[PDB]
Amino acid sequence: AEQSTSAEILETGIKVVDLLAPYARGGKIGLFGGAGVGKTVFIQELINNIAKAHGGFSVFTGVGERTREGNDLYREMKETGVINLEGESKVALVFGQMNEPPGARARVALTGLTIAEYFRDEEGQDVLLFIDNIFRFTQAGSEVSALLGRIPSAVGYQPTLATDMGLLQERITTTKKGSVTSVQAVYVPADDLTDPAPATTFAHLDATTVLSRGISELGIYPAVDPLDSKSRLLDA
Amino acid sequence: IYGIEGRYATALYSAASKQNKLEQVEKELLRVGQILKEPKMAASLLNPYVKRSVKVKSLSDMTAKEKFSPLTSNLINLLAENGRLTNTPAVISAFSTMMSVHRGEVPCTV
Amino acid sequence: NLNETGRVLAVGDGIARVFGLNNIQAEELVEFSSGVKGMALNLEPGQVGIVLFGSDRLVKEGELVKRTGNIVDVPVGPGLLGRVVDALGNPIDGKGPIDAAGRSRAQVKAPGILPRRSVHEPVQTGLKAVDALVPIGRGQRELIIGDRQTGKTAVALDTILNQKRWNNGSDESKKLYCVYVAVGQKRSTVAQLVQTLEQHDAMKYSIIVAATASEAAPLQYLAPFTAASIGEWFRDNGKHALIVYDDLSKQAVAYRQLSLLLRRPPGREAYPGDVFYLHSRLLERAAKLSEKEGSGSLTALPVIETQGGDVSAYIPTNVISITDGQIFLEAELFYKGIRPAINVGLSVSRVGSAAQVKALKQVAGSLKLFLAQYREVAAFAQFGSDLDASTKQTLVRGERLTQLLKQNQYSPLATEEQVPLIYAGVNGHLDGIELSRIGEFESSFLSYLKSNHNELLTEIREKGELSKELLASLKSATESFVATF
Amino acid sequence: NLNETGRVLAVGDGIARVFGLNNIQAEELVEFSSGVKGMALNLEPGQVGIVLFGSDRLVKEGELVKRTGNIVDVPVGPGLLGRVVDALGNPIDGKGPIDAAGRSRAQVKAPGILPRRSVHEP
Amino acid sequence: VYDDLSKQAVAYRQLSLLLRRPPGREAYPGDVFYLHSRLLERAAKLSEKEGSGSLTALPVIETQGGDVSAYIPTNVISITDGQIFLEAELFYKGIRPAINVGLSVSRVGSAAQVKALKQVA
Amino acid sequence: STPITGKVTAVIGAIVDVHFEQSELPAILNALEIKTPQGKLVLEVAQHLGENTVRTIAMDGTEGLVRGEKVLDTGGPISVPVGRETLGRIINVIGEPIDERGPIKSKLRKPIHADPPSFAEQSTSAEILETGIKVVDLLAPYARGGKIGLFGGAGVGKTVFIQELINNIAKAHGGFSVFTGVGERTREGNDLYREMKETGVINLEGESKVALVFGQMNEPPGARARVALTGLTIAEYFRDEEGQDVLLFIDNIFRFTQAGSEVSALLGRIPSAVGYQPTLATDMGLLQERITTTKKGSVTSVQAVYVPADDLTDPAPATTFAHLDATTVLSRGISELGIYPAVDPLDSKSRLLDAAVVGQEHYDVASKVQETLQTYKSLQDIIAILGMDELSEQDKLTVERARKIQRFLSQPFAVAEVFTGIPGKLVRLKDTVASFKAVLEGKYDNIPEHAFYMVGGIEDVVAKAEKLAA
Amino acid sequence: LHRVYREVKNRLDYHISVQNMMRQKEQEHMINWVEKRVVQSISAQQEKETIAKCIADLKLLSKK
Amino acid sequence: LDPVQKFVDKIREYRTKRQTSGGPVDAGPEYQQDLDRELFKLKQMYGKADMNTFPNFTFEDPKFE
Numbered sequence A: 001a002e003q004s005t006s007a008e009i010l011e012t013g014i015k016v017v018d019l020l021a022p023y024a025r026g027g028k029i030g031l032f033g034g035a036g037v038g039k040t041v042f043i044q045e046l047i048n049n050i051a052k053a054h055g056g057f058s059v060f061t062g063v064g065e066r067t068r069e070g071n072d073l074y075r076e077m078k079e080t081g082v083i084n085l086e087g088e089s090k091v092a093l094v095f096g097q098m099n100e101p102p103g104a105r106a107r108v109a110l111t112g113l114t115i116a117e118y119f120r121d122e123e124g125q126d127v128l129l130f131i132d133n134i135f136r137f138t139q140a141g142s143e144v145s146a147l148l149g150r151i152p153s154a155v156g157y158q159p160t161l162a163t164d165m166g167l168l169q170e171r172i173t174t175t176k177k178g179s180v181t182s183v184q185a186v187y188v189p190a191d192d193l194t195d196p197a198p199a200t201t202f203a204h205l206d207a208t209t210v211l212s213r214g215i216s217e218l219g220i221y222p223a224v225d226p227l228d229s230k231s232r233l234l235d236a
Numbered sequence B: 001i002y003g004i005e006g007r008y009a010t011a012l013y014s015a016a017s018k019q020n021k022l023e024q025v026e027k028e029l030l031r032v033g034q035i036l037k038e039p040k041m042a043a044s045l046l047n048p049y050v051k052r053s054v055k056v057k058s059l060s061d062m063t064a065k066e067k068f069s070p071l072t073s074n075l076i077n078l079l080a081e082n083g084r085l086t087n088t089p090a091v092i093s094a095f096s097t098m099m100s101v102h103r104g105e106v107p108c109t110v
Numbered sequence C: 001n002l003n004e005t006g007r008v009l010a011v012g013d014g015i016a017r018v019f020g021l022n023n024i025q026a027e028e029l030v031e032f033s034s035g036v037k038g039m040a041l042n043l044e045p046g047q048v049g050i051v052l053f054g055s056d057r058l059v060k061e062g063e064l065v066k067r068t069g070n071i072v073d074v075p076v077g078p079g080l081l082g083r084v085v086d087a088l089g090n091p092i093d094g095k096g097p098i099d100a101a102g103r104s105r106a107q108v109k110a111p112g113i114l115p116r117r118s119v120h121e122p123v124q125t126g127l128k129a130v131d132a133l134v135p136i137g138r139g140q141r142e143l144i145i146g147d148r149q150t151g152k153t154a155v156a157l158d159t160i161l162n163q164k165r166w167n168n169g170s171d172e173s174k175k176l177y178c179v180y181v182a183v184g185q186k187r188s189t190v191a192q193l194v195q196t197l198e199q200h201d202a203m204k205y206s207i208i209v210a211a212t213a214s215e216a217a218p219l220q221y222l223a224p225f226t227a228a229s230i231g232e233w234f235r236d237n238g239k240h241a242l243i244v245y246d247d248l249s250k251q252a253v254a255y256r257q258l259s260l261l262l263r264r265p266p267g268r269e270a271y272p273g274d275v276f277y278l279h280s281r282l283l284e285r286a287a288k289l290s291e292k293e294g295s296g297s298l299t300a301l302p303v304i305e306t307q308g309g310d311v312s313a314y315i316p317t318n319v320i321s322i323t324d325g326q327i328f329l330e331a332e333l334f335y336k337g338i339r340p341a342i343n344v345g346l347s348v349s350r351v352g353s354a355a356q357v358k359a360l361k362q363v364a365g366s367l368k369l370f371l372a373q374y375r376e377v378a379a380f381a382q383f384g385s386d387l388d389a390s391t392k393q394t395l396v397r398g399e400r401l402t403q404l405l406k407q408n409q410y411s412p413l414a415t416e417e418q419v420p421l422i423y424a425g426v427n428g429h430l431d432g433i434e435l436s437r438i439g440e441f442e443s444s445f446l447s448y449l450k451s452n453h454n455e456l457l458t459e460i461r462e463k464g465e466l467s468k469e470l471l472a473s474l475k476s477a478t479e480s481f482v483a484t485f
Numbered sequence D: 001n002l003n004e005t006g007r008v009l010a011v012g013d014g015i016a017r018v019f020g021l022n023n024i025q026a027e028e029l030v031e032f033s034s035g036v037k038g039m040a041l042n043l044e045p046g047q048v049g050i051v052l053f054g055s056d057r058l059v060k061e062g063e064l065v066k067r068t069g070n071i072v073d074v075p076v077g078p079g080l081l082g083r084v085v086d087a088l089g090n091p092i093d094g095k096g097p098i099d100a101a102g103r104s105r106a107q108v109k110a111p112g113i114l115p116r117r118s119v120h121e122p
Numbered sequence E: 001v002y003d004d005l006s007k008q009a010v011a012y013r014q015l016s017l018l019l020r021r022p023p024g025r026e027a028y029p030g031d032v033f034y035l036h037s038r039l040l041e042r043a044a045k046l047s048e049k050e051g052s053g054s055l056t057a058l059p060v061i062e063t064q065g066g067d068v069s070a071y072i073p074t075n076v077i078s079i080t081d082g083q084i085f086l087e088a089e090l091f092y093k094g095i096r097p098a099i100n101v102g103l104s105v106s107r108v109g110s111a112a113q114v115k116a117l118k119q120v121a
Numbered sequence F: 001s002t003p004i005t006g007k008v009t010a011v012i013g014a015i016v017d018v019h020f021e022q023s024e025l026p027a028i029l030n031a032l033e034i035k036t037p038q039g040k041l042v043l044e045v046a047q048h049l050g051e052n053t054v055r056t057i058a059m060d061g062t063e064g065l066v067r068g069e070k071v072l073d074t075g076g077p078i079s080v081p082v083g084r085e086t087l088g089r090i091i092n093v094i095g096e097p098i099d100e101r102g103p104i105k106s107k108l109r110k111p112i113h114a115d116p117p118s119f120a121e122q123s124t125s126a127e128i129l130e131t132g133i134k135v136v137d138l139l140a141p142y143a144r145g146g147k148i149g150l151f152g153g154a155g156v157g158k159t160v161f162i163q164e165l166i167n168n169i170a171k172a173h174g175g176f177s178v179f180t181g182v183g184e185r186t187r188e189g190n191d192l193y194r195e196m197k198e199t200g201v202i203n204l205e206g207e208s209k210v211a212l213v214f215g216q217m218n219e220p221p222g223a224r225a226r227v228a229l230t231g232l233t234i235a236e237y238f239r240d241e242e243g244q245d246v247l248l249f250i251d252n253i254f255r256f257t258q259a260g261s262e263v264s265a266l267l268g269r270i271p272s273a274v275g276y277q278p279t280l281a282t283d284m285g286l287l288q289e290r291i292t293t294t295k296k297g298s299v300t301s302v303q304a305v306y307v308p309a310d311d312l313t314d315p316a317p318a319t320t321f322a323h324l325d326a327t328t329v330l331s332r333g334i335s336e337l338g339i340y341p342a343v344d345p346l347d348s349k350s351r352l353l354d355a356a357v358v359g360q361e362h363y364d365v366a367s368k369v370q371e372t373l374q375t376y377k378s379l380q381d382i383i384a385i386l387g388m389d390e391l392s393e394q395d396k397l398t399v400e401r402a403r404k405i406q407r408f409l410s411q412p413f414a415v416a417e418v419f420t421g422i423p424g425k426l427v428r429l430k431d432t433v434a435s436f437k438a439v440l441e442g443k444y445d446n447i448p449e450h451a452f453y454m455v456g457g458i459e460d461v462v463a464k465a466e467k468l469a470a
Numbered sequence G: 001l002h003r004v005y006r007e008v009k010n011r012l013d014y015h016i017s018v019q020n021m022m023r024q025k026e027q028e029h030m031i032n033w034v035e036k037r038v039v040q041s042i043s044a045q046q047e048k049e050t051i052a053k054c055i056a057d058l059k060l061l062s063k064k
Numbered sequence H: 001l002d003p004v005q006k007f008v009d010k011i012r013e014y015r016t017k018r019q020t021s022g023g024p025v026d027a028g029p030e031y032q033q034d035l036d037r038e039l040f041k042l043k044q045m046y047g048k049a050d051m052n053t054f055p056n057f058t059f060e061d062p063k064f065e
């Protein structure tokens, strides 16, 4: 009953976005492409824009984040201005190192989700939740369910996989008070989309912003690929 | 009677003797014998379907509602720890002979 | 006692389950009546599962076992340099007792988010195809993945040898102590590997942690962590240490063995869920400490052996996901002659130029381009001369640029000697030279500079950069030699 | 008493856990009260695992079991020529008893390394 | 002539599983190899002292989808003195019997073949 | 005497459980004995289940064991005969004579189980070993006192290969040799024993220079898993105590893992990936470590490895590579072409494949041959899709040569003379290198390819090419 | 020069390695000797069968 | 446990051993044998010279290639 009865577009601040693959308000967006395409640069952007257009804060969540990258990220964010120590920050950071046990890894996401829901139900803002990467979240579960003794499903993943995915994606939605838009990266295991983990993830994704090397190679910034970027809200 | 199996009771009641629970350990041990004769028990005291630490819990039900609990609330888990609930009746018999040697092995000055 | 001691209930498969020790710690060492030691990994309410470091022939039933009150610890410090120790840290070379400056726990927590710095100190491997294409950085985790007999060890091995250029110097923040971790390798191999470093005077700054295949599984389990601490010492004290895990593949197999025998849940390919937590908790230990922490640094070069190029396997996928780049090697490329066979196409480095000498960066930025277009137009080389001139030009370069990367083993070159070769290659001063004489070209060219243009080489070695003056002076010296050739 | 006999504890799927038989050999033939014969493959203190050569709808808990004392063997010799027998070597063609010359076991050791000749006969 | 050991292993697999004996690969008992090894080795040529007697064996196996890389088949290919591979595809082409020479070999070779026929081919 | 009595309590396949008395339990890896009317069924301690119960592994047929037979503790691991007394005699796993020559009079009896030599004892050598096989001596030459591996699927040529090596090294070796048949055709042994008499290596009424240990496939999982150790122990003796060169021939070494793989399930071991047992790396390890050269004596080892389903990614083969200095991989894809021994020139490598070992000239010639055969295989997609005419002048000239060298690698063995009909030919390394060198320079671009197929020395190529022209 | 060093140091290190080996060995037989004198203490001393029922009945209790 | 403490019994036996001066306590001919064996491995490791003595040196002439 608290769910909305209509999907609306969420103005980001990028032509390549609003015109081609627009972000769904309270939907799930898939971000492809690793370092080299300025992934980090494309993230801090969405945090600024929305902070000025919708004035909604952002929450970054790192599951099995590389301690190396976590450092350079934090530092970069202070150089861009998305995070000011003396002034006012706009985004909260919640990293989950890789050297941590599966237990913690599989909960990092929920930790960041909680903080985000606060500004949705309390302050009613269009908060953005960033998850990198939704893949290690499934892997985390797989190691946990593995140790517990639970029998391995198809491909080795956990049987409970189906329910877990929903205990995170469903919580990210637009309510009557506020809304939470998820911008989580996606990793394709062995360049195969038949695999359960990806298959299950895409079932919630509403849009996908791909970042190709060949796009940034032509001097096009951001490296967003117009052909690959698609949205489920691209209708009259 | 043999020794190793008979020592089990004597190595458990040994502490019992110091207290004088031979009655609570000898009378209890008698229970373990009837439990083995119970056809329904044979399907529980030797069922590999339960577990190694699970079946031990269900024992408490036959340890707190049969006679055990004190000098038998240890020998119970030990009797079902490795799976010696097949020839355990022989261990109880030794108790009757070892329980009589404790009466003489005491400073009889009074 | 029953609290500090225990009785062996059952023994086998190099794992004995003991009863007692109600106060024993997790992963704590213990000592049996016979003398063989072990560590308890499983702590059950009734019994305690303990792995063995020696034959299970020594351990019997009912045997007595006592605590050690100490977790797996290994002695660290500069005394190890030039020695050869086992997983535990005992001498096996026969050079006497070791002189350590302290001990460190096998299990150490990686440096936090804050106490680190963006890698910026290059790790010259002395490999042209590496330092030019895939640059490695002090604190980086570069993975040497490849099939059997491809040249994985060659990469690391040359790297170590290429360190005599700084370790015999005076400055410390420039040196680099090398820690090799032999896992699952026969003794004969180690004895040779060691004997090679000596004939090159490299043992002077190398630490060998041998973990032969005949040794108990747990030894092969603790080896990487043991050696990990040893190098961290250097890192903590404000220095530089290079550690090469050769190979992690064997380690996982060992660990799998213990886990299965202990009856822990089996996952993909019979690997327990904590197998990833194993390597992630190992590689993350190496990094680049900040200025406040000591500016110290620990580089990691883990080795993974694939089965027919299958990088999609479980173990490899784990490792590749954690590291920060790969030096993929293919047997095929090896057969053609391209040695070391480093697949430029796959080999990548996330840090890149951040950790590469600007002297070489100025001539390498373009070298990745030509090679890139060469792999695309490589099929055309098989067809008649009917190829247009445009594409043909690419083939002329590629053939020669690929021929230059071919570097003999045990023959590392300093940056001062790399730049001149890359600069002549990129511009295309070799295109006129036959593709058969490219080898001798390097020889006669280097000897030329070191007798007529020695002043140029030495300026590149010290400055580390190429000014407009040098770029012109280097070009003039090249065109002169190519002319007289 | 139970040295040469035993009582069935469970039975199903052609398997029968009989209790007793503490002098039966490994892979020894046995006979139940029903008439159906069986083979002992698993020797354990508690019970003995036996496999049935026939249907198991005839064996029931608490049934008597007897032993053969001999390893499962089959009749051998020229007599069999032209006859059609079953595993055990009994006639199934219906042409009289099997006139065998000797009886040899099922499991026989392979011929020696010494007593061999290189194959030359087509 | 055994026809076929492929079924025999399935049978022997059934006793194992039912006797609650742990399976190896594809449920077959660990010693499944030892099932055919101690069978085929029983056939061989005896010494002149023994009687010059002999026993020849023609084991038969049933592959699935032409997959000779299977568990049981590989176990037997390793023991037998060669194999007469038969392909379905050659059968239709009109090669009958469809013996694939490319894969069919005899380890005894010409030693066993007739001397006359040995010359002409 | 004061022996320890015992009693069998369980019998499942090749796994026998004995129940001893308190304080009387034998350590792991101890032998046992059970008196039978026929013979003796030795057992080997494996685990200690507890409650004075031990689980052993039947060294022979388990049929005929009665619930509760009294077992006699040997008091120590399986003892095998050692010394020159075992020369010229056939021995099984238990160390009993099986050649009908009466008892083996040995002064000592050393256990089959022992620890691997110390890292300090390890001695590295760089000497080369001349066999006589072109494709080997030119590409991957074997090292004196080194470990050799002959990989290959079923029916590739691993046996004939290792057999020739014996026909060219064993006689030509002034020392002792040990052959160990593990999990193979009993008939192959027979032929072997026959040839050793006919060659003169083994003399029944004279001296011998080789011992024979067989534990073929007809034997139960217990035997095939320890027969490798039985023969190793006899070799090792000549290594340290005799202090002299020794040739160890193992065939096949894959049965060592397999055999253990069968019983691992029954010993309550959770099957590892691919079905193999978890203890693969260690077991395969504790065997190869012992097979090595120490400062006391030199041991040249020739172990043939089996490749299940022609798959090299299989753990068993995969693990074995690291314990080898010289690897000679055999490809079935090479057999089918008719070229034998089906040796893969690219995949086969060696330790002595160094300029500073085989010579500078030797390395260059070897490298050229490899590069030629590689480009050939690289153009295989053009020679069928565009023909030979489309290839460039440099390509066609190379391709022709690659085809000549390829066929030039084939060599007739005196052992497989019954297969090829052509008399064996042994080529010397000094001439081998000189042959390809000449062919690489194009000095024989006129001679026909069929003149290089199944030919020994280079002289024979020219002789053959001339005999065909007639 | 290097050779003189290696060789002398080598002679020196020998003494340490030896010394070290002796210590280890001895302290093996030393702590192991403990075993056989304690298996003699319980097996013998019938008054070390009283210190049996003792410490052990102090198990049942605590746990609960 | 408190009874578990009553360490005492171990010390006493440590004490009697340590109080013994006449080689390694309760010899057994094996000790020497093992000793000698390990004493031999170290010879292998460290070389065949008299380690009680200062070393001789005859140096190699230089070598030219």
Ligand SMILES: Nc1ncnc2c1ncn2[C@@H]1O[C@H](COP(=O)(O)OP(=O)(O)OP(=O)(O)O)[C@@H](O)[C@H]1O
Pocket (backbone or CB within 6 Å): C147, C148, C149, C150, C151, C152, C153, C154, C155, C305, C339, C340, C407, C408, C409, C410, F321, F322, F349, F350, F351, F353
């Ligand atoms: N750069 C090189 N130049 C010439 N030869 C090389 C080079 N690198 C490796 N080799 C050759 O490679 C062989 C060993 O290769 P290498 O040890 O590098 O592979 P690896 O990764 O160790 O494989 P494995 O896992 O079997 O040890 C040697 O025989 C040597 O001749």
Ligand SMILES: Nc1ncnc2c1ncn2[C@@H]1O[C@H](COP(=O)(O)OP(=O)(O)O)[C@@H](O)[C@H]1O
Pocket (backbone or CB within 6 Å): E105, E106, E107, E108, E109, F152, F153, F154, F155, F156, F157, F158, F159, F160, F161, F340, F341, F411, F412, F413, F416, F419, F420
């Ligand atoms: N030199 C050779 N020339 C041609 N064929 C050979 C040669 N050596 C072996 N073979 C073939 O290989 C077969 C024997 O294979 P074998 O050596 O037993 O291989 P595997 O080791 O795989 O069992 C022979 O029948 C023969 O046809």
Ligand SMILES: [Mg+2]
Pocket (backbone or CB within 6 Å): C152, C153, C246
């Ligand atoms: Mg290597």
Ligand SMILES: [Mg+2]
Pocket (backbone or CB within 6 Å): F158, F159
């Ligand atoms: Mg063979």
